[PDB]
């Protein structure tokens, strides 16, 4: 993985991003709309059952009640939830409030935990975004086309803008997460190695990371306003606000609203005001970790006979610019016979990255054609040929460094090897010829240790 | 004849003719031959079809009986 492991699982990315935030921002995060998200995104039952324990108990409990609640045949699963206890960063171990090592949760989060489960009040039904009492009365299939257009524009920036001329700043945004790579001889950015896998599963889990990308700056942006705004589209459809958000807003709320609309999770009316309605893709974000859909017959079907892998053709306007972005295949006279002489076109794209797991994922999981009709394994004997093409780019290495030669003793060269290894500037060592490669970044420090020993 | 197999190709495409370039080409080589029988040489008869005989009189019978 090159930057997508934290996207498949949502409960792991939220705990990692929470550890590197400001203490004043985390205080405002502990609200009533955030209580239904730190538990629903989880999966194990042990990490979810401890939330109800800290709600009824008013006094801190020691660790003796925890080591006994596992009875005798359950402490093995207790160590798995130990690392997760520090991920949410909501508990606190005291000294001895009534026994030994008393565990207590932040009372700021405990107050808002009962509002969204048992107790209530009034401010919860007054603020917008989190509520917004408004029904839907607009053509639903007419708005589904705008949800696909928001994601199609992103595809143009990954290729090089073949026919788009919008002013959306989306090329630099995806470059921070390692998805888009800036072209060195030119100026339109291309795509990285991890960007190919995003155009395969087509899951709305990646759009959740794009919303928290602007918050990573930690300058003048708060999380309490983003968390209360992201809860709008999480309630599927029939969750609006008419014009209640217009009266209660500011300059910071309008900035995050324009960026979320361009992602493909919510649709906004003209003039960037009036009534807003979330898209259809936001339903799959709260359902599971992935999803499928978009076809009813699946006309595509590959070949499992030869080795050039005849890719599928004739589908829609999505697979036309998608295969050319992978490795730029070829086409003949009829209905665009793609991938017919794959021998040199694949090696052109592998020279800029080790894109080996994305081609196999696109060859095996493209529309589920062979695994439903046929029975044996989809790839024949190409699993070894693909690995051979990746090893061809390992025959050389373009890196700089300095070499030290002509020593005197053998036991003296072994001491110098530990100097470059601890600092992290050592690449390759040789005890038979007394040779060591040192990167130029730490060249001014290795020469000092040799003059003293 | 090639005119019979053309109708089966148009029904397979389902409301669509195969372009039209190869349609006018279906008029070149036909089924013709010779048979040796009691005549102790050659007896000119091929198949029960009819387009295989019309396009031949303007070559061999015009120069020799």
């Amino acid at each position: 993985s090159r930057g997508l492991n934290r996207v498949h699982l949502q409960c792991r990315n939220l705990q990692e991003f929470l550890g590197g935030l400001s203490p004043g921002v985390l205080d405002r995060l502990y609200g009533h709309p955030a209580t239904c998200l730190a538990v629903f995104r989880e999966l194990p039952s042990l990490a979810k059952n401890w939330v109800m324990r800290m709600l009824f108990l008013e006094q801190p409990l020691p660790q003796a009640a925890v080591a006994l609640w596992v009875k005798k045949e359950f402490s093995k699963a207790q160590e798995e939830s130990t690392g997760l206890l520090s991920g949410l960063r909501i508990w606190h171990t005291q000294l001895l409030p009534g026994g030994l090592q008393g565990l207590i949760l932040n009372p700021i989060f405990r107050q808002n935990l009962r509002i969204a489960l048992l107790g209530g009040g009034k401010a919860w039904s007054d603020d917008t975004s989190q509520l917004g009492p408004d029904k839907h009365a607009r053509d639903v299939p007419s708005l589904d086309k705008y949800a696909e257009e928001r994601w199609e524009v992103v595809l143009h920036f990954m290729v090089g803008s073949p026919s788009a001329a919008v002013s959306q700043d989306l090329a630099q945004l995806l470059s921070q997460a390692g998805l888009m790579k800036s072209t060195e001889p030119g100026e339109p950015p291309c795509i990285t190695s991890a960007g190919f896998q995003f155009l395969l599963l087509d899951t709305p889990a990646q759009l959740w990371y794009f919303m928290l990308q602007y918050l990573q700056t930690a300058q003048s942006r708060g999380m309490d306003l983003v968390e209360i705004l992201s809860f709008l589209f999480q309630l599927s459809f029939s969750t609006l606000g008419k014009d209640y958000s217009v009266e209660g807003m500011s300059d910071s709320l309008l900035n995050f609203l324009q960026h979320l609309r361009e992602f493909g999770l919510v649709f906004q009316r003209k003039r960037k005001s009036r009534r807003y309605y979330p898209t259809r893709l936001a339903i799959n974000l709260s359902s599971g970790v992935s999803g499928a859909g978009g076809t009813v017959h699946q006309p595509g079907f590959i070949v499992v006979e030869t080795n050039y892998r005849l890719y599928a053709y004739t589908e829609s306007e999505l697979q036309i610019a998608l295969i050319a972005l992978f490795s730029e295949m070829l086409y003949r006279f009829p209905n665009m016979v793609v991938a017919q002489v794959t021998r040199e076109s694949v090696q052109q794209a592998i020279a800029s990255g080790i894109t080996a797991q994305q081609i196999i994922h696109f060859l095996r999981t493209r529309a589920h054609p062979v695994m439903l009709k046929q029975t044996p394994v989809l790839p024949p004997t190409i699993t070894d040929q693909i690995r051979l093409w990746e090893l061809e780019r390992d025959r050389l290495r373009f890196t700089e460094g300095v070499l030290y030669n002509q020593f005197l003793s053998q036991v003296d060269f072994e001491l110098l090897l530990a100097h470059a290894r601890e600092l992290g500037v050592l690449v390759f060592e040789n005890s038979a010829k007394r040779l060591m490669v040192v990167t130029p970044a730490g060249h001014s420090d290795v020469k000092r240790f040799w003059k003293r020993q | 004849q090639t005119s019979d197999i053309t109708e089966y190709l148009r029904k397979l495409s389902k409301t669509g003719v195969p372009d039209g370039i190869m349609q006018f080409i279906k008029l070149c080589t036909v089924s013709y031959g010779k048979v040796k029988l009691v005549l102790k040489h050659n007896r000119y008869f091929v198949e029960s079809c009819h387009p295989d005989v019309i396009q031949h009189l303007l070559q061999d019978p015009v120069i020799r009986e």
Binding site: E305, T306, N307, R343, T381, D384, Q385, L388 | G33, K34, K36
Partner: protein
Amino acid sequence: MFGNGRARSGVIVLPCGAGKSLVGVTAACTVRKRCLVLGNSAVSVEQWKAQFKMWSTIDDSQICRFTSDAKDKPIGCSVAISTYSMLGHTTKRSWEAERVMEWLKTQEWGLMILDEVHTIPAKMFRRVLTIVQAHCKLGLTATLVREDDKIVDLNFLIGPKLYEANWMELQNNGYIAKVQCAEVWCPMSPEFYREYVAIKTKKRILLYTMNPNKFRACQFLIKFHERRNDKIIVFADNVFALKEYAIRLNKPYIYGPTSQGERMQILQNFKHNPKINTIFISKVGDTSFDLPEANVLIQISSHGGSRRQEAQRLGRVLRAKKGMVAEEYNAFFYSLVSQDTQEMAYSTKRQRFLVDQGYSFKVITKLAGMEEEDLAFSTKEEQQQLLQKVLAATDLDAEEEV
């Protein structure tokens, strides 16, 4: 081919290790035609004649052989077994070829039985239709195209393509061995690669051919099948290349310029009265007197002029371990191809032919287990002594005529 009383000239596809000369005799009885067998060499004379014994009475009534010095009944029969048109030399063969050509156009004009026409040029086909007035032609060739040509089709003079059989049904029944293709790419030796891009003569062919990294793999493949006492034969296009491959590891060997009396007993030492297991053949001892018919074949060179002759050799040599295979595999087939020697030009074209034969194809670049085996050329000193012998070998060493 003949199922309505008409002609329909063409070439049919049939398995090689099932009876290529057997379908011609059976078809000659239903067609009811005084056919004429035209073989490709000397081995085709004894094959076609064997089918006229246990199936008809033509062997002792209407038999004739114009080749191999026989001339049995020149007048009174038309069914004969000749060899295309290789019996027509200028001046040297004057009245000999005249009596054969004149007396053939009078009492024979039936079917032109042809076998293995994918390596015969169009110049020989002109002399075939000239010396005989056959009214029909028969094609018995299992290959698809000829001499690996995709821009010029010279098959319209001896019958074009007619019909091909389902190789998936032929292989999964008991007609051909379960060929398991697996390419073996061996690294190039650095001591022999320096002189390959140094000279500009034909001597560099033997450099990568005598690869010590490939010789260790060639000996490992023999040892891998020695414990399984299976019929294995290493193939090689060059004549003086397979000789060293058998003397270093103490095994017999045969090649072209040897002797007719010597190969008469050695050929019987593998099928009739065997005594030797590992034998090395070439392009001469296969379509001359008897078919090899082994089980495991190893290809060393893949750049010779015979880019289509080894296609039919894959079916004739690699025979099954019984004759009526059920549904499991057992036969193996590897290929030794050098690396960084400009050899992939032919190693790529073989993939288009193997996918049509229903054979399993795969690539294995690392044998994984070759170093941990009692083999030769273990040290770097023995590999250096081979350089002083390959470069010292004269290129004139070929036959002895002027």
